[PDB]
Amino acid sequence: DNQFYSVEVGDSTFTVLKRYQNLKPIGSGAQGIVCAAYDAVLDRNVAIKKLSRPFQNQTHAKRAYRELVLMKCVNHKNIISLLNVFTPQKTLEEFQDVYLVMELMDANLCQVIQMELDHERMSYLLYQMLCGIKHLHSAGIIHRDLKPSNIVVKSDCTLKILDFGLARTAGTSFMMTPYVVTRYYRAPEVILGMGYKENVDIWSVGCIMGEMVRHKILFPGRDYIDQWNKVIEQLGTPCPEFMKKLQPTVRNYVENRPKYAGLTFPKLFPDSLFPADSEHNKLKASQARDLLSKMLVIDPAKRISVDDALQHPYINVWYDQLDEREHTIEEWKELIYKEVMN
């Protein structure tokens, strides 16, 4: 009689439409609170994400709203597409939770990165990331925060980007919740507050690709201080022309850091990290190292574009505005509610 039922999945209560059966937590890789379930109507397995009081603060509200709007005007095989959106609450006054429903995947990209993958698999995952990223840019979305934990994969190696990245406006306001933001995949133009173009996302692809090879986060650190140190110790101090594009205060800090020549790409990614069993693999290792050297480039003006990355020999084998202004709790609640109601 009631269209919904509630079930305990870990520490969270999931109140879902009765079509969704056998809820099981994914736990990792995901994210917020995400369940696997059987959709009896579509006779297919789904993933269900619960957004708990998304209007509770400015940060959760901006992201919930922006992603609800974009998950509607984006249509691509390598970008999340929603099967359903619902709230168990009947009125705006009663409104609390948003549930998002998508195709159930098999792993997040962090798990895949931990595997010893062949060149076929590595090049195929990278091509899809580049394809999804190309789609976003054509829609006028520049991600800026692409990271493995918001990327999921199926057993057949098909890939999907689950989020839309950083807000147009800022400045990444505090989060009074026990969770940390992963910043290791952010481009120098993001680390140093610089201004950017489409290829800001190429750096993130390079960090993901390097980690697949190395099996260690390329640029770790407590925050941006430590992180920038990791970037300059490995790639070398950037050229004077890149530094003439930084804000005065940021420029001062960067130029006053000790100088590093930077390790060469064969030293940053030796042959021993790649299969050396055949001629086919010897060429694929040199092609992968060449693409890494074009992607992990501090200056964006000298960094490879999405289109040129797609045409790169390691990759091309696979070729076949509203509303970020300040709002109160009540305003965000209504804006989110009407998008949930469409």
Ligand SMILES: Cc1cc(NC(=O)c2cccc(-n3cc(NC(=O)Nc4ccccc4Cl)cn3)c2)ccn1
């Ligand atoms: C055949 C099979 C596969 C299983 N899959 C996993 O265990 C697994 C592991 C890791 C990840 C995933 N995954 C995570 C997502 N979605 C989201 O993370 N978020 C999200 C969700 C809904 C709407 C919107 C968003 Cl953003 C999708 N699949 C599944 C489990 C059991 N059986």
